[PDB]
Design an enzyme around this catalytic site. Sequence first.
Site, PDB file in Angstrom:
ATOM      1  N   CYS B 120       0.807  -1.220   0.000  1.00 44.43           N
ATOM      2  CA  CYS B 120       0.000   0.000   0.000  1.00 44.43           C
ATOM      3  C   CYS B 120       0.842   1.273   0.000  1.00 44.43           C
ATOM      4  CB  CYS B 120      -0.971   0.017   1.196  1.00 44.43           C
ATOM      5  SG  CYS B 120      -2.073   1.441   1.109  1.00 44.43           S
ATOM      6  N   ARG B 123      -0.275   4.598   2.706  1.00 43.34           N
ATOM      7  CA  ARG B 123      -0.137   4.446   4.146  1.00 43.34           C
ATOM      8  C   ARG B 123       0.132   5.679   4.995  1.00 43.34           C
ATOM      9  NH1 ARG B 123       3.693  -0.597   4.877  1.00 43.34           N
ATOM     10  NH2 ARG B 123       4.361   0.015   2.768  1.00 43.34           N
ATOM     11  N   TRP B 292      -9.195   5.714  -1.241  1.00 43.19           N
ATOM     12  CA  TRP B 292      -9.452   6.405  -2.499  1.00 43.19           C
ATOM     13  C   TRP B 292      -8.405   5.955  -3.530  1.00 43.19           C
ATOM     14  CZ3 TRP B 292      -8.795   9.600   1.951  1.00 43.19           C
ATOM     15  CH2 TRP B 292      -7.512  10.161   2.103  1.00 43.19           C
ATOM     16  N   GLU B 297      -3.935   3.325 -10.963  1.00 42.62           N
ATOM     17  CA  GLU B 297      -4.688   2.088 -10.752  1.00 42.62           C
ATOM     18  C   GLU B 297      -5.761   1.965 -11.833  1.00 42.62           C
ATOM     19  OE1 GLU B 297      -5.529   0.856  -6.434  1.00 42.62           O
ATOM     20  OE2 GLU B 297      -5.397   3.027  -6.254  1.00 42.62           O
TER      21      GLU B 297
HETATM   22  C1  HEM Z   1      -6.345   6.293   1.577  1.00 42.05           C
HETATM   23  C2  HEM Z   1      -6.009   6.013   0.285  1.00 42.05           C
HETATM   24  C3  HEM Z   1      -5.323   4.881  -0.190  1.00 42.05           C
HETATM   25  C4  HEM Z   1      -4.571   4.839  -1.325  1.00 42.05           C
HETATM   26  C5  HEM Z   1      -4.327   5.991  -2.279  1.00 42.05           C
HETATM   27  C6  HEM Z   1      -4.058   3.506  -1.471  1.00 42.05           C
HETATM   28  C7  HEM Z   1      -3.443   3.055  -2.606  1.00 42.05           C
HETATM   29  C8  HEM Z   1      -3.136   1.731  -2.833  1.00 42.05           C
HETATM   30  C9  HEM Z   1      -2.506   1.228  -4.037  1.00 42.05           C
HETATM   31  C10 HEM Z   1      -2.061   2.003  -5.266  1.00 42.05           C
HETATM   32  C11 HEM Z   1      -2.369  -0.084  -3.879  1.00 42.05           C
HETATM   33  C12 HEM Z   1      -1.918  -1.046  -4.973  1.00 42.05           C
HETATM   34  C13 HEM Z   1      -3.132  -1.694  -5.619  1.00 42.05           C
HETATM   35  C14 HEM Z   1      -2.795  -2.670  -6.733  1.00 42.05           C
HETATM   36  O1  HEM Z   1      -1.704  -2.563  -7.333  1.00 42.05           O
HETATM   37  O2  HEM Z   1      -3.648  -3.543  -7.014  1.00 42.05           O
HETATM   38  C15 HEM Z   1      -2.871  -0.399  -2.560  1.00 42.05           C
HETATM   39  C16 HEM Z   1      -2.808  -1.659  -1.978  1.00 42.05           C
HETATM   40  C17 HEM Z   1      -3.265  -1.977  -0.717  1.00 42.05           C
HETATM   41  N1  HEM Z   1      -3.841  -1.051   0.185  1.00 42.05           N
HETATM   42 FE1  HEM Z   1      -3.974   0.854  -0.025  1.00 42.05          FE
HETATM   43  N2  HEM Z   1      -4.447   2.687  -0.422  1.00 42.05           N
HETATM   44  C18 HEM Z   1      -5.286   3.532   0.338  1.00 42.05           C
HETATM   45  C19 HEM Z   1      -6.091   3.078   1.390  1.00 42.05           C
HETATM   46  C20 HEM Z   1      -6.109   1.812   1.930  1.00 42.05           C
HETATM   47  C21 HEM Z   1      -6.864   1.431   3.114  1.00 42.05           C
HETATM   48  C22 HEM Z   1      -7.902   2.327   3.806  1.00 42.05           C
HETATM   49  C23 HEM Z   1      -6.504   0.159   3.457  1.00 42.05           C
HETATM   50  C24 HEM Z   1      -6.918  -0.695   4.499  1.00 42.05           C
HETATM   51  C25 HEM Z   1      -7.539  -0.431   5.680  1.00 42.05           C
HETATM   52  C26 HEM Z   1      -5.526  -0.213   2.429  1.00 42.05           C
HETATM   53  C27 HEM Z   1      -4.960  -1.468   2.338  1.00 42.05           C
HETATM   54  C28 HEM Z   1      -4.204  -1.872   1.260  1.00 42.05           C
HETATM   55  C29 HEM Z   1      -3.808  -3.252   1.044  1.00 42.05           C
HETATM   56  C30 HEM Z   1      -3.832  -4.438   2.011  1.00 42.05           C
HETATM   57  C31 HEM Z   1      -3.285  -3.335  -0.187  1.00 42.05           C
HETATM   58  C32 HEM Z   1      -2.893  -4.662  -0.842  1.00 42.05           C
HETATM   59  C33 HEM Z   1      -3.737  -5.034  -2.055  1.00 42.05           C
HETATM   60  C34 HEM Z   1      -3.363  -6.388  -2.665  1.00 42.05           C
HETATM   61  O3  HEM Z   1      -2.443  -7.064  -2.140  1.00 42.05           O
HETATM   62  O4  HEM Z   1      -4.002  -6.776  -3.676  1.00 42.05           O
HETATM   63  N3  HEM Z   1      -5.276   0.802   1.501  1.00 42.05           N
HETATM   64  N4  HEM Z   1      -3.350   0.727  -1.914  1.00 42.05           N
HETATM   65  N1  LIG Z   2      -6.757   2.577  -3.497  1.00 38.91           N
HETATM   66  C1  LIG Z   2      -7.030   1.345  -3.083  1.00 38.91           C
HETATM   67  N2  LIG Z   2      -7.544   1.145  -1.874  1.00 38.91           N
HETATM   68  O1  LIG Z   2      -7.725   2.441  -1.213  1.00 38.91           O
HETATM   69  N3  LIG Z   2      -6.781   0.330  -3.897  1.00 38.91           N
HETATM   70  C2  LIG Z   2      -7.006  -1.092  -3.616  1.00 38.91           C
HETATM   71  C3  LIG Z   2      -6.652  -1.938  -4.834  1.00 38.91           C
HETATM   72  C4  LIG Z   2      -7.537  -1.459  -5.993  1.00 38.91           C
HETATM   73  C5  LIG Z   2      -7.227  -2.005  -7.403  1.00 38.91           C
HETATM   74  N4  LIG Z   2      -5.842  -1.659  -7.805  1.00 38.91           N
HETATM   75  C6  LIG Z   2      -8.208  -1.387  -8.398  1.00 38.91           C
HETATM   76  O2  LIG Z   2      -7.758  -0.715  -9.348  1.00 38.91           O
HETATM   77  O3  LIG Z   2      -9.430  -1.570  -8.224  1.00 38.91           O
END
Ligand code: HEM
Ligand SMILES: N=C(NO)NCCC[C@H](N)C(=O)O
EC number: 1.14.13.39
Lengths: 414, 416
Positions: B120, B123, B292, B297
Amino acid sequence: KFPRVKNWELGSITYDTLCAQSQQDGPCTPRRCLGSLVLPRKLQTRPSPGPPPAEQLLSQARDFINQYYSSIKRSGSQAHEERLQEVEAEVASTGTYHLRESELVFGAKQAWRNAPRCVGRIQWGKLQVFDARDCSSAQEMFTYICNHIKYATNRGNLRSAITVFPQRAPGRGDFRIWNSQLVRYAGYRQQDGSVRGDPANVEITELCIQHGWTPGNGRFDVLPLLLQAPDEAPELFVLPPELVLEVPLEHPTLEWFAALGLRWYALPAVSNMLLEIGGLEFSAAPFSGWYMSTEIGTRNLCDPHRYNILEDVAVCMDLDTRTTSSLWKDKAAVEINLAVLHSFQLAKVTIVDHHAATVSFMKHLDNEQKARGGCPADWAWIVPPISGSLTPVFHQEMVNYILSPAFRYQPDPW
Amino acid sequence: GPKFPRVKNWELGSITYDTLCAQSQQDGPCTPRRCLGSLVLPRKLQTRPSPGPPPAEQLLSQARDFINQYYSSIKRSGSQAHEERLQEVEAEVASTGTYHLRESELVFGAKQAWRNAPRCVGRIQWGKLQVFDARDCSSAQEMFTYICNHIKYATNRGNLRSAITVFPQRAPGRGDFRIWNSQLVRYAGYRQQDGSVRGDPANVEITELCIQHGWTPGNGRFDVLPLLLQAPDEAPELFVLPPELVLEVPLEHPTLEWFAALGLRWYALPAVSNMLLEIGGLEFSAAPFSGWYMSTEIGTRNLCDPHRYNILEDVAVCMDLDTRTTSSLWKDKAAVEINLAVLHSFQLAKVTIVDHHAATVSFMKHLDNEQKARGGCPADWAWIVPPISGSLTPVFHQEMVNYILSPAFRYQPDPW
Ligand code: HEM
Ligand SMILES: N=C(NO)NCCC[C@H](N)C(=O)O
Ligand code: HEM
Ligand SMILES: N=C(NO)NCCC[C@H](N)C(=O)O
Ligand SMILES: [Zn+2]
C-alpha cells in the site's frame, strides 16, 4: 524449493529448476526481502589477503570445467578428464590456475547470460571476446581499450564486445580501470555546490584532475581514463575524439529541442565490474553492447541526481509545471525518450527501445526455460523506468539468484 | 556498521537501517539462495481454511504478542491492566478455545494492519480510518446493510473517507462470513461466443457465479455486479446495490474532445473485500476496506493492462499514432493521456483521487515518519513504484525491505 513462476497477462506457469544450481547466496533471508537493493556487502568480491582455500577454488574450477565440456558436448571425454587434472595439478602447486582462451570465451558468454539485471541477454551468444591477459602496463591497457572501442563502435553499427585484462593474483595489486565506463561525461562541482555536467561522475572527475588532467567547463566533456597496473599509481590517457562516437539530440517534430544542446555517446561500456570465471577473478574486463533508449532518455537525462532536464523540457513544451496532476513530468519524459530514438536512428547508431527490448527478453526467457529450466532475473532492473506495465516483462514473475560465471560489483580502487 | 539491513536512497545518497524487520515473526518467500520478491501470490501469508482453531498455544503466543502491541501503543506496557488482559485472554482461550477483542483493540489492530501492508502506497493516511464494528452481524441480509452503510459513509458524495467494516471472526465449528466479490464495486466480465470478453476480463469468474446464483446479466462494458454475500454455513445470497449508492465518473480528456465519446468510466470507490484481516491470531474473513484511488490504478492498470480493458491501441488510433512500430512510443503517449483523463475527470466530478507523483511523495514522507517511529517500514518495491513513469517518482530511487508484520491483511482462498 522449486518456485512456481507465473505470467499474469497470459496466465501461464513455469517452474524454475535452474535456481537449484545457485551456490552463491543473495542478501535475502526468509525473515525479510532485500531484492530492491542495488549494491551488497555479502555478494561483494573482497580482495586477496592471500590465496583463497585450494578446496574452494578447486571446487569452483572443476564445476566451470564441467560446464565448459558440456557446452562442447565432450563431457566425460579424455580431454575433459585431462583438463580437470591439469587444473587440480596447477592449484595444488601454485594455489591458482589459468584458463585457456576457448574457456575464457565460453566463460564470458555465460557470465553475460547469467546477469540478472541485463535485459539484452537474447544477444548473449553473440559476443566478441578480446584476450588482453597478455598485458603488463597501463599503456598496454590503453591500446587494448582503444581497440575495443574501435571494434565495438563500428561506425554506428555497434557490436557487443568484452576485453579481459589479467586476472587477480594473491599478494599483488589488481589491474583496474578507475572509470565506471570507458566513455562518461565530467561532473564539475561548481562553487555553489551545484554541478556542471554529469553529477554521477563528480568523484572520478576530481581524481582525473588530481592526476594531472586539465579540465574543461562543458556539460558534456568526455573524461580521460585512469588505468592502473598492479601496485602502481593510475595513469592518465585521453581517448582520441575520433574514437568517441556521440549523437546530438534533436526531436522529430519539436524544432527547439536541438537548441537544448543535449547529446550522448554511442557506446555503453561498463568498466568497473569484476568478471568471475571458475574461481578466477578478472578485476578489469570492460564490456559493451548497445543502449536501450530509456537508459539515456529516462535515467541519464531525467534522474533528479543526474542531468535532471525534465523541467527545462516541460517549460519549453509550455506545460503546467505548477501542479503534479497535469502530468507535465510524464509528458516531458516521453518526448525526451522519443528524441533519443529519433536522434540515434537518424545518426545510424544502433539502439533499441524498451518495448522491443522487453519483447525480445520474453523470448529469451522462453529460450532459457527450455535450455536451462529457468532464468535469473531482477524484476526491478528488467522492467523499464517508464511505462512499466505497458511492457510484457512487468506482468512476468521472475526469480533472482546468482549463477557463475558472473559479473559482480567490486570496491572502488581509491 | 549496524547488524540490520542497510537501506539506501540513491537520489539523496542517504542511508537508514531497518531494525523493525527484527520483529517480523512470519517468514516470507525468499531464502539466501534465491529471491521470490516479484511473485504476487507466494504461499506465505496464505490462510488455507484450517478445519479447527489454531493450536491453543500457537493462538496464545499470537494473542499475547498482539495484547503486548496494544498496551505498548497506549503506553501501559507492564502495567496491571496489561497483565490482567493477558490472563483474561488465556482463560478465555482455555475455556472456549478462542478469544474476543475489545472495541479499542479491534480499532488499533485494523489500523496496524493497514500500517503494516507492504503493497500500500497510501499508508501516510494509516492513522485516519473509520472502523465500523460489525461483529454483531448475524445474516447475509445484515451484511448487505452494513456494506451499504460502508459505501455511503466512505463515498460521502465524492469526498471519500477511508473505512473498513469488520464482520464476525472465524469461529470453531462454524462456517465463515465471506464476501465472494473481490471488491464491493466491480464491473461485469461477459465471456463471448468468439472467446473474447465484454467488460472486465478480471471479473469473468465472479460474473458467472452471480449468474449461476440467479442474477439476470446485462450486456454492457461497465455493468456493476451484484454482491454474493455468505453468512455462516449458508449458501451465498445475491444482493443488488442500489445504483444511487454506486458513484461513477464518466471519463473525458481536458483537451482531446473525442475522448468523452469513448464511453469510458470508472467507479469512485476502491473497496477490496476478499482479503482476510488477521489480528492477534484471530481471523476476520470478511472485512472490506476502502480509501481512495491513485490514478494509475485506473488509467494504467485497469484500462491499459493487456488482460484488462486493453484500450491502448484504441486511444492510440484516435490520437493518430503509428501503432505499427514500437519506436513511435505510441503506447507511452496514449497511456499518458488516459491517465490525464482519469485525473481530470475525477477532479471535474469533485471525487477524491491522488496522482502517482503526489502519492509517492507522500509515501516518502510516510517512510521518514516510520523510520523515527518504528525503525523501518515494510515495503514491496514492485507494488509501490507506479506502473508508468517509475523513475520519475522518488520511490523508484528508494531501496525497500519487505517483510510480514502482524496485524495484517492477507490473501485467502476463494470460498468456492
Ligand atoms: C487512503 C487512500 C489509499 C490509497 C491511495 C491507497 C493506494 C493503494 C494502491 C495504489 C495499492 C496497490 C493496488 C494494486 O496494485 O492492485 C494499494 C494496496 C493496498 N492497500 Fe492501499 N491505499 C489507500 C487506502 C487503503 C486502506 C484504507 C486500506 C486498508 C484499511 C488499504 C490497504 C491496502 C492493502 C492491504 C493493499 C494490498 C492489495 C493487494 O495485495 O491486492 N489501503 N493501496
Ligand atoms: N486505493 C485502493 N484502496 O484504497 N486500492 C485497492 C486496490 C484497488 C485495485 N488496484 C483497483 O484498481 O481496483
Ligand atoms: C546487446 C545489447 C545490450 C543491451 C540492450 C543491454 C541493456 C542493459 C540494460 C538496460 C541494463 C541496465 C543498465 C542500468 O540500469 O544501469 C543492463 C545491465 C547489464 N548488462 Fe546488458 N545490455 C546489452 C549488452 C550487454 C553485454 C555485452 C554484457 C556483458 C558481456 C552485458 C552485461 C550486463 C550486466 C552485467 C549488467 C548489470 C549492470 C549493473 O549491475 O550496473 N550487457 N544491460
Ligand atoms: N546497454 C548497456 N550495456 O550494453 N548498458 C550498461 C549500463 C549503462 C548505463 N545504464 C548508462 O546509462 O550509461
Ligand atoms: Zn527477496
